[PDB]
Swiss-Prot record, chain B:
Region AAA-ATPase, residue ranges: 44-172
Gene (name only): YTA7
Chief place where the protein resides: nucleus
Post-translational modification: Phosphorylated by CDK1 and casein kinase II during S-phase, which leads to its eviction from histone gene promoters and promotes histone gene transcription.
Boundaries of the shown chain within the full protein: 407 to 1378 of 1379
Biological source species: Saccharomyces cerevisiae (strain ATCC 204508 / S288c) (Baker's yeast)
Record's protein name: ATPase histone chaperone YTA7
Length: 579, 578
């Protein structure tokens, strides 16, 4: 955990790399520029984000990248709260020694991993053992004497657990949020992990993997690549898994194929799925004909509410690159006026999706959350509120809304609003509404709620009246005839397939070599048309759930006779079922 | 430790004067302590919010008291840095510390983060911490009658220090470092932006001090550092791409207004890191809508709180009032006049009520931003039930207690209509009983903002005992002139040229490497039609509805930011307002 990593290993965090250069490498090479204004370079950064986003990798790359020249950067790394012992002496004494030896080797980086355990928040009881550590840490990090060129880096899952006196200029003046990688950063991470391989993958395959890995972190992508490689080893040379002696194998023709990555995709569960909220994922390919017609409309509406496709201001992905490629150009009437009139476009982002019971709302919500890739999703659903048994409903709601306030582009998500307004206490809705009306108009905190058979009277003169769902109510109407036709057309395409097409795996004729130790398908188109007509007629004024039920029931019948070439039996069974 | 002089610290002149007294006059004018059988003050305890100048004050005291004609030595021990696993070796270290601080006649001692070194009295934990606090008590209580050991103590929470160490004998004077106000932030920014090659205009520094509410000294320093760093990035970006030193020269790196305005959006003050934000002035866009009725709301607050006069301690430092003012029959006269000066506050109450969504969140924030010297205690829902352990009762009582400690305080209750429903009856009655057990002269202001609050609730209801009799301010919907100004500001974007819009353009030529050592058509008739339709459509509208119309029309206007034939945009604006 010391070396052999650099900044080309890191993918999708190019904005923070520039600032870390600006605080570590740049002062060393150019001390005249910093001393020109009599400023001290910022020292100490608090990395926080979802686990497996690259904080420790970022710190190691900082330590090993700025030391490429003949200016060594010693890297003192401390695990979370591993310094306190059973007595009262060593806890502060060892921190003292750490900072003194950091002073000795003047260009140095102390990395407190999991700093939330070393410096907890001051609770009601058990004060001494952690207060005596926090006080001395505060004393050495911003003492009277010049600490020197010691860059203090802390890493945490959440920053609220660190003492606020640490989150102060001179100690932790910069706080870096490491976000879950988007599609481009995931593409770059996949390219990086599959860079040293002997048989590189194609670019389009990496793009498709990046699309398929929505919700993954960097760590999840690395685990996926490792699992794909392990499956490739298992597929090429299974014999090494049986013998206890080292057989002779060749690191060749062990190229990874798509089938191995697909299997690793089911073997790996992301950190998105471990969470209790709704995992943002695109519309599954089966239901896409049914819903995508009315999902695009929502996107268009969202496009007119959050100004997603109209991004001329607040396009800050990387300030340094902006200064590199773009070019500047009285003062107030050219910056303040236009900035204000650009942020004046978001008034009060709200959206309530309300459809009949079972009309694929769990699907539309996930698709919308996937479209808003750059937004910070906060789930106010019942499961997330009640999952932390120590917290209360009100406390969880306040925590979620306050988290959504920072990281301004964010979405407060309330799936199953009809259940939510019936199982939550009446005062929590009032607290949330007071929080939302205590917001500025130009704030991009979208309130997206999905409800099943919600009465409009409850929104007009009920408890949800003070959320301002006036024009922002979208009705998810039942799917039309053409979408049902496309759904069952895919079903029929499954029906009229030859058994030589349906993938049956194998039965190998010859055993694996030992290693040296060291008919025609009969289906008239008339029957296909009759089955299509019966499916269309049976599902009249049906929702998405009923259509899925009919699809599953018919797919069972079709897959039953997946080898029979005379498909009249499956056809008459299908017709009999729809009666 | 640098050569920081006292002219580096800004906004704490009184404490600088007191420290100069207690450091020099005991040793420069010794006879004045004989006629009065009184000892010089021995202990001083600095306390306040983080990043205010405690360590700066100690470092300035060290640097100033080191010169040719007199020597003063500084001894620093950091918080709990003196203890070890050995049982009584910490006692030996502290005792020998005081021995060298006594053997050297000239030496003053400083304990940074004293609350960690000396916590409160130990009910449990009879371990070495209690022995350390007892030895500190018994060792700094006295070993020299009228000596030269000054024990300074820096801390963030003064209440975490052992009460036996806060005494007329040990830690005599307790100094409170406040978050700087506008005048002090001006001086701090001048001190930071002093040695720059191209100083800033004083109006810009005033505007900066206006915007940086809640910023400490450290926050302003960080803001200056970030502005300089952004200037360095903007001037010489190529230094961020090379791994070896290039040749860049100063005197072309100038810190402009844009860099400061871009650094403010990324710096969050230490008073808002765990809170999210701080109360901001009235936003520029809606200023034509509410500033007409906000100024009145300021004047009332300037009448029931005596803000503009501040007849007690209005100048910089007390020694300065003794220097440049002359003092004045003082036994009864002074008591009478102090009584009459304090009798100008009866019961500061204010209930700002208006229709739904009439910009109350803006008015409350602007008012809380106006009251600079006031310790705001928020009693909203998000602050009471934020914790899952303390009850609403305990939170409300504790918040009122903290408001009572720091006497100029504003108990702030936004969304009173939701508040009188979410908060049960017992908590409202407890808060009322707390408010009726105060003196009339107490400077605790109960500020309340509500939407569509029936006055039946406030003269005969739950709030009837809070004495909101004649202090109910009515926010009415903005008049036609305010709407006209708002939409004229909106329309001025329609009249701007496509080449005038700050649309950043790609540079036609790459960055230079360094040595490796047409008039748009808009007839005024369309502008008049747009103004008339905008005015007519937003009749008797509230602030939220006006903002909705403004956003909806700004979207259409910003769609045609490059077009010159603005007839289509005007037609779309007319069509939407129908
Ligand atoms: N942005 C990224 N770019 C490249 N690799 C990443 C990124 N984020 C995570 N990784 C990979 O994930 C692995 C583990 O990351 P880790 O340091 O455990 O993150 P965290 O400390 O947040 O859990 C690293 O070895 C790294 O290769
Ligand atoms: N009153 C002040 N005037 C000028 N600078 C200040 C002031 N207070 C704090 N600072 C700045 O804060 C930094 C040190 O603050 P510090 O002493 O650490 O505050 P505290 O010890 O109260 O947290 C210095 O860089 C200094 O520039």
């Amino acid at each position: 955990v010391d070396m052999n990593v650099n900044f080309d290993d890191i993918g999708g965090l190019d904005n923070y790399i520039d600032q870390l250069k600006e605080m570590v490498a740049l002062p060393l090479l150019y001390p005249e520029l910093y001393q020109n204004f009599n400023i001290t370079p910022p020292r100490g950064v608090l990395f926080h984000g979802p686990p497996g986003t690259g904080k420790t990798l970022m710190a190691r790359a900082l330590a090993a990248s700025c030391s490429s020249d003949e200016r060594k950067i010693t890297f003192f790394m401390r695990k979370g709260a591993d310094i306190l012992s059973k007595w009262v002496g060593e806890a502060e004494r060892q921190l003292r020694l750490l900072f003194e030896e950091a002073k000795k080797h003047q260009p140095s980086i102390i990395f407190f991993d999991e700093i939330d355990g070393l410096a907890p928040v001051r609770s009601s009881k058990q004060e001494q053992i952690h207060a005596s550590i926090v006080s001395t840490l505060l004393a050495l990090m911003d003492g009277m004497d010049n600490r020197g060129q010691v860059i203090v880096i802390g890493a945490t899952n959440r920053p609220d657990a660190v003492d606020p006196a640490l989150r102060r200029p001179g100690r932790f003046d910069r706080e870096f949020y490491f976000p879950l990688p988007d599609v481009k950063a995931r593409f770059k991470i996949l390219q990086i992990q599959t860079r040293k391989w002997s048989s590189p993958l194609s670019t389009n395959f990496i793009d498709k993997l990046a699309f398929l890995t929505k919700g993954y972190g960097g760590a999840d992508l690395r685990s996926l690549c490792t699992e794909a490689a392990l499956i490739s080893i298992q597929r090429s040379f299974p014999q090494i898994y049986r013998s206890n002696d080292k057989l002779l194998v060749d690191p060749s023709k062990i190229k990874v194929k798509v089938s191995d990555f697909m299997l690793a995709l089911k073997k790996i569960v992301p950190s998105s799925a471990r969470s209790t909220g709704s995992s943002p994922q695109p519309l599954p390919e089966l239901i896409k004909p049914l819903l995508a017609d009315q999902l695009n409309n929502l996107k268009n509406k969202l496009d007119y509410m959050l100004n997603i496709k109209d991004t001329t201001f607040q396009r800050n992905t990387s300030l340094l690159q902006n200064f590199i490629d773009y070019e500047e150009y009285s003062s107030f009437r050219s910056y303040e006026f236009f900035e204000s009139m650009a942020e004046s476009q978001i008034c009060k982002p709200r959206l309530l999706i309300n459809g009949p019971k079972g009309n694929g709302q769990q699907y539309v919500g996930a698709a919308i959350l996937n479209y808003l890739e750059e937004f910070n999703v906060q789930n106010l659903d019942l499961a997330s509120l009640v999952s932390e048994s120590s917290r209360t409903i009100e406390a969880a709601v306040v925590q979620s809304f306050m988290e959504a306030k920072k990281r301004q582009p964010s979405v407060v998500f309330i799936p199953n609003l009809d259940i939510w307004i019936n199982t939550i206490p009446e005062n929590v809705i009032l607290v949330l509404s007071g929080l939302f009306r205590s917001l500025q108009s130009n704030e991009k905190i979208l309130l997206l709620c999905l409800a099943e058979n919600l009465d409009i009277s409850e929104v007009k003169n009920g408890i949800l009246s003070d959320f301002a769902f006036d024009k922002n109510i979208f009705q998810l109407h039942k799917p039309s005839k053409e979408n049902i036709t496309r759904y069952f057309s895919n079903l029929i395409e499954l029906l009229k397939t030859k058994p030589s097409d349906i993938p049956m795996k194998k039965r190998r004729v010859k055993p694996l070599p030992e290693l040296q130790k060291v008919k025609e398908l009969i289906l008239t188109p008339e029957q296909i048309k009759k089955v299509s007509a019966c499916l269309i007629e049976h599902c009249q004024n049906f929702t998405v759930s009923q259509l899925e039920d009919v699809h599953s029931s018919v797919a069972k019948i079709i897959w039953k006779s997946k080898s029979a070439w005379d498909k009249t039996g499956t056809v008459d069974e299908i017709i009999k079922f729809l009666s």
